Amino acid sequence: MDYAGGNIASLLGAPSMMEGLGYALRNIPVNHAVATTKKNMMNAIAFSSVMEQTATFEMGDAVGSFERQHLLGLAYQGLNADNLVIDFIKANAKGTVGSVVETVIDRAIADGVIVVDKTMSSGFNMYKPADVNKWNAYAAAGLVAAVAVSCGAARAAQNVASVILYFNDILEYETGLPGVDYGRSMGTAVGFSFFSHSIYGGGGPGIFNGNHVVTRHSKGF
Amino acid sequence: AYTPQFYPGATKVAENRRNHLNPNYELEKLREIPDEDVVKIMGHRQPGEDYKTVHPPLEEMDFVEDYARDLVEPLNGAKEGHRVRYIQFADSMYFAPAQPYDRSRSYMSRLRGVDAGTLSGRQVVECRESDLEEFSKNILMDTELFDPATSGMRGATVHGHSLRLDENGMMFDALQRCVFDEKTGHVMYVKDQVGKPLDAPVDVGEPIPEAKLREITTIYRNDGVAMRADPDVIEVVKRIHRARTLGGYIPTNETFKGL
Amino acid sequence: AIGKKTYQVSRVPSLVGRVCDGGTISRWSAMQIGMSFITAYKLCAGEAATADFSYASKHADVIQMGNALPGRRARGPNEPGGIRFGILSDVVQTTRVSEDPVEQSLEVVATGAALYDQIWLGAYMSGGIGFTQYATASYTDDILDDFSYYALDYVEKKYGRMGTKATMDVVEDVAGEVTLYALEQYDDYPALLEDHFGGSQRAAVAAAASGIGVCMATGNSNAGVNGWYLSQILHKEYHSRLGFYGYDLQDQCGASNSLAIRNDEAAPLELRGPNYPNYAMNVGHQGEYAGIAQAAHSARGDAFALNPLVKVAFADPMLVFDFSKPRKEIARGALREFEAAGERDVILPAK
Amino acid sequence: LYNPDIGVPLGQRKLMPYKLSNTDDYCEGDDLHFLNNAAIQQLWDDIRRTVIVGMDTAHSVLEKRLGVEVTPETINEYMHTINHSLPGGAVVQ
Amino acid sequence: EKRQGIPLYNPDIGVPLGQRKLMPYKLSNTDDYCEGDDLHFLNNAAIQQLWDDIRRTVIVGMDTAHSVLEKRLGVEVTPETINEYMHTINHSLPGGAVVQEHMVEVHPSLAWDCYARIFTGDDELADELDSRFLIDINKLFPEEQAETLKAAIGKKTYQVSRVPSLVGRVCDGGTISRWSAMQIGMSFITAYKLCAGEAATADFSYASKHADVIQMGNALPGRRARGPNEPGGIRFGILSDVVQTTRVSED
Amino acid sequence: DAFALNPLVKVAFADPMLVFDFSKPRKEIARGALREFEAAGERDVILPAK
Amino acid sequence: LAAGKIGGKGCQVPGRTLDISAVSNAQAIADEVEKILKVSEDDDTAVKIINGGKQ
Amino acid sequence: IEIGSYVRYINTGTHGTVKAIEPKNDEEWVLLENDIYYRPELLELVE
Amino acid sequence: AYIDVECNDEAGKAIYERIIQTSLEDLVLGKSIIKAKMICKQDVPYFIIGILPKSKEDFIDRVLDFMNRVFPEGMRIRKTIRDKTIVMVASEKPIEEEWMNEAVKLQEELKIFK
Amino acid sequence: MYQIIRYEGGVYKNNILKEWIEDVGGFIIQEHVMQLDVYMTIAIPQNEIENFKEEAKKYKGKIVETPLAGIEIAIVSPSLSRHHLPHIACDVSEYVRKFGAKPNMIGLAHGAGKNISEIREKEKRLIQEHDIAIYVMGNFESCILDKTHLFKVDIPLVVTGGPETLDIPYTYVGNLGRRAQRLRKGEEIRALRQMIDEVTKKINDKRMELSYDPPIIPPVVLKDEIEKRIDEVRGILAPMPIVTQLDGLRIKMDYDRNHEEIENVKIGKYLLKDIAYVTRSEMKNYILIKLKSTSE
Amino acid sequence: RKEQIVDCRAVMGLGEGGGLAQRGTFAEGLRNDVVVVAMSPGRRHITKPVCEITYGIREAGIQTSVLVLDAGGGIPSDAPQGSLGSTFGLKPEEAKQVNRHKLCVIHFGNVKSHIIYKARLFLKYVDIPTIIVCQTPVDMEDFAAIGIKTKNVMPLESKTEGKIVEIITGVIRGESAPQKKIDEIIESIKKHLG
Ligand code: F43
Ligand SMILES: C[C@@H](OP(=O)(O)O)[C@H](NC(=O)/C=C\CCCCSSCCS(=O)(=O)O)C(=O)O
């Protein structure tokens, strides 16, 4: 019940071969998005983000209280709203993932997105979000910027899993704040790591899509 | 701007973790291993010969015009086109100076264009070969991040992170890459990191005294510094857990009032 | 719970499920039920009422151990990937022979490990060695037993078996205390550390103890998994290591998904299973999840967790496997003194 | 003095037997493999081969559609029949 | 003995069997007779093994793996290395664990039917390989049939993995492919020692156990929900190819 | 024709190491009906003799 | 919800019992669902009451 | 059997050419192209 | 397989039943044998072991290995009779005719076992 | 004075513990390193027992009280064949070893059968050279009762057999007959513990009779002195180069080549030949030392 | 028929319900004729394939010693591209304990490339004829291909002073060895011993 040995193809797979209900739109792999946009970074990011967030709207996830968070995620991660991604990349041209985390926290503090919760006995003034959804959007934009910085420094696409995982880790244990998608981004990064970095790994990062058991956990982030 | 803290806590373990995470903190160096010796232990290339390439130099190859992609300055190994290699370390649970997740966080905070992976008894970082050798010699091997007894550069068979130390205080090794020379009191690597023997053993210094290990370690232990003695880290972990739970339940400002 | 209703339990031969797959069982039972009905009441061999009997027995009144997994998973019914945690809790019969809630939860943990981690993830979705030392870590030595008994003692000293309502603060308190105690025990006794040499084993044991303690404090299974995930992310900071990379996928998404209400993420832990999207790849979680689900009800002294019919059906004394004491039966099988069915020696030549 | 042909002993703990929790039996680690343990295989087999059927709709259809009266004696006869038919015995044809 | 008085087989209930003469059954082209009960698939071990052999068969092509090893991984591939890999996979496929005594392994007598075989349309590589675990097309098929099969196959190398029957007995048919892939990956990373990084190992894993896998049957959708390597997914041409009478008969 | 749909399956099932020889399925079914067929998958070494 | 009949055929989870009055508050529930599902103002979003709020 | 002949090992089938015959310990031995001694009784002539 | 021991010693009966079971398991002979009866006569040293197989020479060799494993060490003089039922008498003394008669009685009793 | 115990700990910092034992005057009788854990049978003065317990708990070690770690036991199987050797006999030997004793498997040449069983004089003397002998018999009451002539040695005796109760004029432990499985059931473990208790009682009685007239020098310190003086004892390839018996030692070196060196060893101010009976052993031509009492 | 006394090891076994032997230990059979070498005290080597050969030899009338190697698992460090998983080795005291016996019997596993190099390292320090008991069908000559002295297939450049004197195939680890294999081993020992 599929088109296996045929010579006719489409971007969407058979609806009976979906990971879950409403998962049809998360079937375009990363390589297809990159090839369609002719290897343009911002356009490929916009394509992937648009598809993922439209799918989240289709899956019923972006309904009621989650619609604002998914809209902000789309605007700030895919469409470069407020120029956050470009600003972070420019500020960390020679930087690392930690410097990207620092710039993200500085921008969030300057914009009023996060405030100081309390200062513990051993210093470490805790941070709480004055705007939870906006903080998630800022963290997602910073995640994209960190991936761009690290993979432009290495000029290799094998760093994505580690960059996302440890960006979220460093941010969480630097601010006391939740990461992108409240740990779902970190879990999906662990999935990427064990899917593309071992003999029980399979394939590379170019064939990642949301319609897989390994990469379905983050709702378009 | 924003002056970054790096880790909560007041104990010595939290301070050491902060020091590892801090890129402006100069790690104290405890040995001098020549670059060629580090390359020999690494076992990827013969010292003195040129680096193998995976693609032509970035100037030779033609790429489409990409303003955002061109904002980031590439590594020299990327500029020339070198193969991506790895260096792997195993850390003992008995007061090793560096620990897997601590190593990965410090690597991603201090180095550019690195791929760090964390396991319970393993930690590997991948980078272009020239830069990988550079920061392996400068940071990974010569500084306090490495102890020749409780830690070991080793690929292939890794086992002994949870086992007890041997009679010389060295971590268990199923391949015996490094042995203890009692005449000089130094640890010598008789094999490279994957297991093929070296023609000339390389002196990697002598084991760090246990008193210094208690001070420079990044692990929490009942016999050493316990997490119960550091309530600040536990509070931050619980705050992260509660924030994750509240965000996964309903991500609004009203549900986060119970944070 | 059952009411004034009559049920029939059909146990088709094990050889049938060994030659064929697990989807054969319901159809086998349905055909034999239909034949027995038409021949016991002297009815016509084939009419409309025969179709009514067939439809009833094939789907209207049938109870399957595991649901089918069509699509990507591609599996039939009565497979270990379709068995929910509450169903497996009801399969274990320690609740009717013992009053110790920790013992009941730990027998369910042992059964869940031996089923999920060893069969479903060891061979159904992997191969070769499988995951034996990953699962035996939860039922070989008393490490998990000692941690769970400490959790129960700590809960009873300050909360009681049901003395508190499930809130965030009690989850943090119980899970953190149990995790700290378990990691201190690992530090203090090198024998325990060398027994659970892999980080995954240790993380699973400590988190299972923390979740069992939270369940014994609150009586809610979702609070139990929340405590499990807090224990995992506290273990990670305590030892700066959790397990093999690829282990903490569900543990990083867990805290958010434990109390979620979204369609793909919400499910009571009794209704969760190996087909839950987060739980559907990684070893060292599912058996302990089933144990936490059971402990949610062992705290209340409940007769069953999800299905009374499953509990009554597996209380049958004629079953080949004794589900009252799963660990004893596993030990008997390990010593080559367990008689198993499904063997075909009457139709085979002498060797 | 360094002799590379001495070797490294390994796996001392894995050689020792594994106790079983709440029991008094010691077994090898190889015998706890699901392929080498018939008890685990039977544990899975018993769950796999179990199906519960509610015999109330069938009784109602026998009563209201076929006009056949259902009594405990008839249920006993049905149980006797199905215990012969379910393993694979012949009842008609 | 076993049922403690619960009745199992009662010929007295139901139809009175044997009102007519219960005929014996011949078997076509064979001079032996048997009762009809002996031909039931549950009472006949031959039919059960017929299904077992088909269920536990997965064919994996090893040419992308060799090319990835040679070029990307920088490891030479020779007939001696192929023989070493075949030894490794033959030890490891049933239950084995290579140079690891601490790891739990399946009892060897429990999987005596497990084999890993190799065949290729390349003649020189075929005669350079060990005959212990090679399926020789030239000596198993007639000359014209062997030529046709070599032309259809090409100059490529394939390995056949026979997962032990017990694995299919305990589990379902979808277990066979995963078991084969896992053991193939372990044997490949053990025989050939590679000092490359782990991403390269992921590419090699795809090339070695997910690039040219041939399954006996496909998964079934809807109410026939089943995994691969189940009898409902086997096409008629595939079953015709399974039977080997074109080899030994011209009728 | 030497094969019908897949040459690889035809070559793979010509293996002499198979327990069931597909060259003569009728003969092997006859052998199995006579209780003279040695099948695999029996757990004789992990079960008690009594 | 009143009997904890979550799970499916013959399934009960003791302890997970909620006492709500959905049928009595059917109008409020329908209004809230309409507000949540509405796209802008004038879409074809309708939640009608059937059988006195029973459906 | 002589130098330049073609021989194969019966136990495995290794093809090679005889290099020299080097008796030792009042016993005949045969050296093949792979620099391995063999036994004449375990070798036979092929053409 | 069916295991029964005819002895007037209580401990010997159970211990040698376990010995027979273990010897059957070690050789993997449990499913290939219908019955295995052992007659223990220790006052006059001689033991009889009878085997009724299910339905080649390798199986016979395995059966004689089973007899060698089960029989006591001191009983070295042994003789066997095989007419589809293998029965062997072991004693430290030359085998007497009455012992052989008991062996044939056991053989005929095992033949009609069903 | 010198209570002998077993220390079970790790090899890390074990040299410092050995230095402490040497400082307080103890002797390391046995040492074995498996992979990372070391088992040490140590004899230390009784006045330092609590100090050594404290020191052991500092290294996270374990102290196991071994009531038989000063004796060597002759386990007499009827033969070394598959009937007795690979099971029961090894279980008896290993359980004896678990309490510190040094066992020796004695497989009789003609020990099998009912009326054809016999014991040679050389085997008799070899058995008598030990401290206590354990007989592993069969599981038939008549066979054992018609086999009493085997147990004729003037050594403490414990007879094990199948039947629960026997009527022999010796100590008997039942439910340990000829088997073919590893002894792991509860009843079998209980019977092994009963045999251990009987041999412990006999050894304690013999220790009391020896303490009535103590020897001039303890066997353990004599072994230490021999090791310090004789420089060929570290070249011995035997399992236990010097065996500590109840009232003597067994030196596993050639008697013809080394008896003169052994005798001319000065302990304190005495020569060894004047305080001990150095004689050739029936055991592979080794050297057997029997200590004299203070009465002579 | 003569008395056979064995010097039992000085250390106990592996726990309560485990094996009776201990790694890195030696049990002399007084009169040194045959030494059986076990790679480990585990169930894969001890009492299933090793003590059976031991009691077969002891039944044949030949005294036997059993030596459990300290590090018998894995492949030697001199194997191509080093060892993996674990390192095989032989101690000088173990070599001396082996070398005082007339003959040696050693039990190997299933992978040929492991067996050949393990035998080469073993015979680098053992100078008595040895018998290889393995499961896989291995040929006398593949040992000579890497420079091992062999009775039928000598190497041009011998890297070992020990002679592989017989290879016996069909003995599986952890499984009871049938009487036929024991008889073959006994016949080979007798006809290469006296
Ligand atoms: C030896 C390998 C190679 C590889 O690809 N996977 C291995 C081996 C693989 C094989 C072992 C069989 C074999 O022949 O290789 C299998 C069975 C894979 C599977 N099908 O599940 C396995 N491991 Ni692994 N593996 C395990 C474990 C572990 C622990 C060991 C910790 C230590 O420091 O000693 C770590 C993971 C971690 O770092 O967290 C581990 C690693 C490794 N594991 C790395 C380590 C070396 C490498 O870098 O290549 N295993 C354990 O933690 C216990 C459970 C155990 C699994 C089998 C069992 O459950 O019985 C086995 C599970
Ligand atoms: C979906 C699949 O992941 P994949 O798509 O990356 O193969 C998923 N997991 C796997 O990677 C496959 C098999 C499980 C292997 C895990 C063994 S844990 S022990 C090895 C630790 S190490 O090798 O990482 O060091 C599964 O099939 O269960």
Residue numbers in the entry:
A (entry chain E): 168 to 388
B (entry chain B): 2 to 260
C (entry chain F): 203 to 553
D (entry chain F): 59 to 151
E (entry chain C): 52 to 302
F (entry chain C): 504 to 553
G (entry chain D): 57 to 111
H (entry chain L): 10 to 56
Quote the study's own text:
The enzyme responsible for CH4 formation is methyl-coenzyme M reductase (MCR). The structure of MCR has been thoroughly described as a 275-kDa heterohexameric complex with an active site that contains coenzyme F430, a Ni-coordinated tetrapyrrole cofactor sitting at the interface of subunits McrA, McrB and McrG, arranged in an A2B2G2 stoichiometry. McrC, a small subunit encoded in the mcr operon, co-purifies with the methanogenic marker proteins Mmp7, Mmp17, Mmp3 and the A2 component.
To reveal the molecular structure of the MCR activation complex, we vitrified the protein ‘as isolated’ and after incubating with 5 mM ATP under redox-controlled anaerobic conditions, before performing cryo-EM single-particle analysis. Our analysis revealed two different assembly intermediates from the ‘as isolated’ dataset. A2 sits on the backside of MCR binding McrG through electrostatic interactions, without contacting the other activation subunits. Our structure revealed two ATP molecules and their coordinating Mg ions, indicating that the structure captured the enzyme in a pre-hydrolytic state. McrC used a flexible loop (C138 to I168) to bind DUF2098, whereas a second loop (V72McrC to K95McrC) wedged into the N-terminal helix of the more proximal McrA, which became disordered and created a groove towards the F430 at the active site. Around the heptanoyl chain of CoMS–SCoB, displacements above 3 Å (more than 10 Å in the ‘as isolated’ structure) of loops F361-G371McrB and K244-E249McrA′ enabled the CoB moiety to freely descend through the active pocket.
